[PDB]
Design a protein around this ligand. Structure first.
Ligand code: HEM
Ligand code: HEM
Ligand code: HEM
Ligand code: HEM
Lengths: 141, 146, 141, 146
């Protein structure tokens, strides 16, 4: 469960993300496909080469759903119902993959947001990413 | 895949008594009922909406038989799992696009199916041997992923 | 989330377990120890030889806590509160280990309950153990 | 270790620029704050109630350096991690009773720290190579558990 400090920590870091959210989203996906090649099995329709437009576009989508979650942080399950249904009944991504994306999102934030990526903030973001994941997988069965 | 001769003997000895046709249908069907997300790969199989629709589906049974058949064959080559499964690995990755975590879930369901059929005979040491075997098969099926 | 059918399934299977719980608790532990040796790092103070009394005793405690959760199936987070603080603040068992024990409990029940361990029941029992594990791990951070 | 020559040389060249004292301190530090349950092995170190306390704790800083020192030695035996880390494995199992899962956690924290320090240079390809090394090292460290 996210404590008050956590929410505050998450809102502030993602605030500095500002308009790079899309770019960071694409970068995280790119790190994930390279570091954890099993994840490519969910995207066989994508051109996965460096700088592809599908990855870019998909990275904006992911980043924007996270922005929505930060803004609806005390109310995640409702803000994400729709994506939650999408992942459980159509995409059906195995839950282990969510940890791989989260780690990559973290590596991405750390590389671009040095001053802001303090130990307590790293802590907070990692719990935040875990709740989002919990939420996206809660209707699987 | 460090199996001791005593582990390999227990594995081979129990496997001799398995009806693979039937065990194969039960394992593939139970995977689809306990872990419904795995149904993403089988939409051409028809109705998978209830436990009975899954367990009795002739396409699930036919596919289970084929899955476990390749598996039994691997038990005849326990020192070369990688080679034995090289072509199936590639196929699963490049053509069928199956996330390898699926091979681990199937291995743990097989273990419960084997426990269900053999009862007491599936002793903790026997289970331990089969856990290393299913981990080995899963890793071999994933080794050609890229 | 547990469904009405899941709850009915778990009560039924657990009732057939009855006064064998303790013994199955122990067998599950011995299975876990042999199949997943890394789990022994948490019991450096126990004798883990076959038939150990410490293992028997602890098996009973695990099974009794599971019996408690089945009796409070609609209020598990509250019924298991004390166990959850214990695991989070003192024991600090890494969460992957719960999956391993839950697997060994399923194998133990399959091995002893051939007529009730149907596919539908296996599914419900698996969901129940995941929920128990989730409760016990909810306060880690 | 399945490492490419271009992967091996990406790892090596980046490491040549690491201040091991700082990075060790920061990794071990970050591990205890982000994953509080890892604190079970360090009760005797002192106050770890807050991130500031953890990061400031000199025994933590010193232990970090010692851990990353050994990791640093392993990077020069990339063709034989198992043999390099064999004794360390035994001791982590037999005397220290550390769950090998913790090794994977440190590995990933370690990777975030390298990105934090090197920014642009810690590019997707370079990260992919460090994930491979870090998984390799955890596996070697876990190998003698029984
Ligand atoms: C942080 C966790 C994640 C979030 C917030 C997230 C969010 C999203 C969003 C917004 C979409 C777009 C839905 C739409 O177009 O309306 C999507 C689709 C999709 N996601 Fe998830 N996602 C996450 C993790 C993952 C994971 C881990 C995978 C698998 C590795 C995955 C696989 C997919 C796929 C394959 C699509 C459809 C792609 C397409 O056809 O364009 N997602 N996700
Ligand atoms: C023990 C691990 C497994 C083995 C040894 C195995 C073996 C096989 C074999 C021999 C084939 C037929 C290949 C062909 O048509 O040329 C096959 C096909 C297939 N396998 Fe795997 N399999 C395994 C696990 C899985 C699992 C866990 C999944 C997904 C949950 C899966 C999904 C599929 C699919 C979708 C096909 C093609 C089905 C079709 O023809 O419509 N397999 N497998
Ligand atoms: C089904 C999930 C589990 C349940 C219901 C459970 C329940 C319990 C209970 C009732 C106790 C007794 C503490 C007391 O006397 O008040 C306990 C202690 C303990 N548990 Fe858990 N446990 C679970 C999983 C795990 C696993 C996965 C681990 C790690 C492998 C673990 C490690 C321990 C340890 C080390 C103790 C202390 C034993 C001692 O020194 O006496 N437990 N647990
Ligand atoms: C990157 C993987 C790791 C490496 C290479 C490593 C290496 C080392 C080394 C070289 C020692 C000193 C041994 C001696 O003096 O004989 C040590 C001690 C120790 N390590 Fe690890 N370590 C790793 C990860 C971990 C983690 C994740 C934990 C637990 C979170 C841990 C717990 C310990 C403990 C408890 C000691 C003894 C400390 C003391 O003297 O009080 N290690 N480790």
């Amino acid at each position: 469960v996210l404590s008050p400090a956590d929410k505050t920590n998450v809102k502030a870091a993602w605030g500095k993300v500002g308009a790079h959210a899309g770019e960071y989203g694409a970068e995280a996906l790119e790190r994930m496909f390279l570091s954890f090649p099993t994840t490519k099995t969910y995207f066989p329709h994508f051109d996965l080469s460096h700088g592809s437009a599908q990855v870019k576009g998909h990275g904006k989508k992911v980043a924007d759903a996270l922005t929505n979650a930060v803004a609806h942080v005390d109310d995640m399950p409702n803000a994400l119902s729709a994506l939650s249904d999408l992942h459980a009944h159509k995409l059906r991504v195995d839950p282990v993959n969510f940890k791989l994306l989260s780690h990559c999102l973290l590596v991405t934030l750390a590389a671009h947001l040095p001053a802001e990526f303090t130990p307590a903030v790293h802590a907070s973001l990692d719990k935040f990413l875990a709740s989002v994941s919990t939420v996206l997988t809660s209707k699987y069965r | 895949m460090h199996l001791t001769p005593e582990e390999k003997s227990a594995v081979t000895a129990l496997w001799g008594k398995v009806n693979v046709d039937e065990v194969g249908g039960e394992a593939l069907g139970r995977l689809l009922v306990v872990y419904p997300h795995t149904q993403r790969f089988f939409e051409s199989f028809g109705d998978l909406s209830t436990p009975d629709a899954v367990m009795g589906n002739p396409k699930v049974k036919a596919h289970g038989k084929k899955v476990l058949g390749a598996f039994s064959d691997g038990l005849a080559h326990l020192d070369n799992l990688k080679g034995t499964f090289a072509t199936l690995s590639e196929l699963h990755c490049d053509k069928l696009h199956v996330d390898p975590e699926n091979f681990r879930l199937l291995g743990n369901v097989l273990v419960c199916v084997l426990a269900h059929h053999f009862g007491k005979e599936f002793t903790p040491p026997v289970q331990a041997a089969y856990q290393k075997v299913v981990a080995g098969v899963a890793n071999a099926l994933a080794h050609k992923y890229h």
